[PDB]
Amino acid sequence: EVQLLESGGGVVQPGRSLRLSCAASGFTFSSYGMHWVRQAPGKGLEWVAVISYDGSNKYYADSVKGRFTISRDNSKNTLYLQMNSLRAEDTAVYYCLYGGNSYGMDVWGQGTMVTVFN
Amino acid sequence: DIVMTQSPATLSLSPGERATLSCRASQSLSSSFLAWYQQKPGQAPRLLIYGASSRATGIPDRFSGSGSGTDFTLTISRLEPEDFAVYYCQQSESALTFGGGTKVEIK
Amino acid sequence: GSHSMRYFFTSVSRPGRGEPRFIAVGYVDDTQFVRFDSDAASQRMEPRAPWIEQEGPEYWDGETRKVKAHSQTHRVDLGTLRGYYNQSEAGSHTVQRMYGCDVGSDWRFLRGYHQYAYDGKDYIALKEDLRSWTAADMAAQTTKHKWEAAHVAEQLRAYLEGTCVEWLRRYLENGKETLQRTDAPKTHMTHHTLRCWALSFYPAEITLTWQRDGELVETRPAGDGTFQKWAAVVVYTCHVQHEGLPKPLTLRW
Amino acid sequence: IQRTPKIQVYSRHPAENGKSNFLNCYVSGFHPSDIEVDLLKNGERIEKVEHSDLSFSKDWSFYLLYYTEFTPEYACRVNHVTLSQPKIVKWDRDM
Amino acid sequence: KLVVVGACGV
Ligand SMILES: *CCC(=O)N1CCN(c2nc(OC[C@@H]3CCCN3C)nc3c(F)c(-c4nc(N)cc(C)c4C(F)(F)F)c(Cl)cc23)[C@@H](C)C1
């Protein structure tokens, strides 16, 4: 059974870093590139980050550029997102996605909430 | 940068009525990289169409996708009570870009 | 023997007939294995070898993404180069780009190429050190300065050293039956002027010579993965030297 | 920068009467990329021409291979900017 | 495989 499970979400004050970890089970994690996609409460889906299958090529959105770092570790089958200098704009539900292909295989994580306030 | 604009913002159709949604890309797109997702209010998005014309596994026959180049359309032939959700269009040719999302609601 | 992977990209500006046409080709040794044509219906990277079809659909997805990025870059490049040269918008102009890598018999990195040409003349060439550029005309100075500001030489060097070599090794291992093959040139003589023919050999590298007491045509593809060539002299032995020949062959009438 | 293409007409296998074979016209070393290459039998063009896809050599000049099914006059007609008049090269068994 | 970064030209 294919499955993506994300942990590390919670309430965070502004200006502080948070780490999200997505573990994949049931499919060959080492062959495919993975995305981090966030959705603000009541707002449309927004793409945050993408990483290749080596981890050599990583790209981030214009809004989150310079503060987000995506990473992957194929030994433990994990995909990490490190968010730095979190602001009030960064509150959203985050999903780890194995999608954006042409053969029609997509897996969506449960999605963890990241809320920013004091 | 690729920009996808979705129309209409909202749809108000009674059950059983035709539904047509449009997604326009800023630049010419390979037809194999467009997808159409359906998100319920309380769940994660679910892939309906991949490749702009091919339905995924376990998708009802009423969903269909068409178009090429810049403009694409998603058609629901007969709306069902479970078909009322928010529909997004996604491109994967360069990075990823979801549309604004068209929410269909009963009149 | 040394094996090389190359990629050739051609972008031709069409004045009013539509967007500029873009063609990409990938070669391993003398065998093509991919192809992208802008006017093809699929608009995807297409396999042109039996072995490369083994790759999964994610490989084709990545290849299509990269080749469409190249197409967009060349489409912008035609306009920016016409602006650099102050050329009229009426004429059609061609832009070519070739890059790739070589591996020796030990399958380690040996050489790397990156070259950009405008209207059939050299424009910007990565040097053999793989850390500097070679620029000829005045617009090439601006292109070199922009590229150096972008730090693209380091990225290209890293690609050519690691990824090109690793994937060339993978392709050769997958295509051991075809790519790692030498065919002895079938040689025979025709008298009319003597014409010495070498037919159905691989790779395209051959040397035909004519000696008296000790014309030519460029090697043409036969179409089935082998090549032909002949050398004629008007009146004496024809000597044929090939990689697949343990010793060169000599033919006399 | 204009370059006159070089044309070679040949069979894939040594031509023999009443045998299936492939007639190929190879055009090499021309600029610009556009060119018209038609294989014609008895002066009539063959509609089933399939050509190899575009490439080029180190000196930035292109080449193409136009090949068809046939059974051993055939010739190859090439039209280009440098050529004032279309150039026909007649296929022959010897060379 | 084709190059990802560095394809940017002129
Ligand atoms: C200099 C070379 C060049 O022309 N480019 C442009 C295309 N490209 C690229 N660029 C981005 O950046 C996204 C930009 C920046 C923030 C705003 N946004 C519009 N992202 C790229 C990608 F995400 C990918 C990519 N895409 C998908 N769907 C999956 C995967 C695995 C990738 C990737 F391989 F990169 F990891 C690609 Cl292929 C290219 C992207 C570069 C080629 C640079």
Task: Locate the domains of chain B by residue range.
Answer: 4-105
Name the residue type at position C206.
I
- Tell me if chain C has a CB within 8 Å of the CB of A103: yes
- Tell me if chain A has a CB within 8 Å of the CB of E4: yes
**Boundaries of domain holding A59:** 3-101+109-116
What HEC string does chain B produce? CCCEEEECCEEECCCCCCEEEEEEEEEEECHHHEEEEEECCCCCCEEEEECCCEECCCCCCCEEEEEEEEEEEEEECCCCHHHCCEEEEEECCCCCEECCCEEEECC
Sign of the Cα torsion C106, C107, C108, C111 reads: positive
Q: Which two tokens stand for residue D27?
A: 């055009």
Pocket-forming residues, ligand 1, beta carbon under 6 Å: A 33, 50, 52, 57, 59, 61-62, 100; B 1, 92, 94-96; C 65, 69, 73; E 4-5, 7-8
CATH of C186-251, one of 2.30.110.10, 2.60.40.10, 3.20.20.70, 3.40.50.1360: 2.60.40.10
Q: Which of A15, A1, A5 is nearest to A116 (CA)?
A: A15
Question: Could you give the CA distance from residue C94 to residue C178 in angstroms, rounded to a whole number?
Answer: 34
The DSSP output letter for D52 is P
The CATH H-level superfamily of C3-174 is MHC class I-like antigen recognition-like (3.30.500.10)
CB contact under 8 A, C119 and D1: yes
Which residues, in sequence order, are CB contacts of D16 under 8 Å at separation 6+? D72
Q: Going by CA atoms, what residue is nearest to atom 29 of ligand 1?
A: B95
Which technique was used to obtain these atomic coordinates? Answer: cryo-EM
C-alpha neighbours within 13 Å on the C-beta side of residue D17: 1
Whole-angstrom CA distances from A72 to A69, C57, C182 are 10, 22, 43
- Tell me if chain B has a CB within 8 Å of the CB of A36: no
Based on the structure, what is the number of domains in chain A?
A: 1
Which of C8, C92, C190 faces D32 most closely, judged by CB atoms?
C92
Cis peptide before B45 (omega within 30 of 0): no
Which residues, in sequence order, are CB contacts of C18 under 8 Å at separation 6+? none
Calculate how close chain A gets to B92, using CA atoms only, in Å: 5
Question: Could you give the CA distance from residue C145 to residue C133 in angstroms, rounded to a whole number?
Answer: 10
Q: Going by CA atoms, what residue is nearest to atom 42 of ligand 1?
A: E4
Touching status, chains B and A (3+ beta-carbon pairs under 8 Å): yes
Residues of chain A with Cβ-Cβ distance to B3 below 8 Å are none
Question: Could you give the CA distance from residue D66 to residue C223 in angstroms, rounded to a whole number?
Answer: 9
Residues of chain D with Cβ-Cβ distance to C31 below 8 Å are none
Judged on CB neighbours under 10 Å (0-12, 13-18, 19+), C72 is: middle
Question: Could you give the CA distance from residue A98 to residue A105 in angstroms, rounded to a whole number?
Answer: 8
Question: Could you give the CA distance from residue C63 to residue C58 in angstroms, rounded to a whole number?
Answer: 9
Specified resolution (Å)? 3.2
CATH number for the domain harbouring residue A45: 2.60.40.10
Q: Which atom of ligand 1 is nearest to the CA of E7?
A: 2
CATH topology for the D6-90 domain: Immunoglobulin-like (2.60.40)
Sign of the Cα torsion C215, C219, C221, C227 reads: positive
At C115 the three-state DSSP class reads: strand
Domain boundaries, chain C: 3-174, 186-251
Could you tell me which CATH number the domain at B4-105 has?
Answer: 2.60.40.10
The D87-90 sheet, strands edge to edge: D44-45, D36-41, D74-79, D87-90
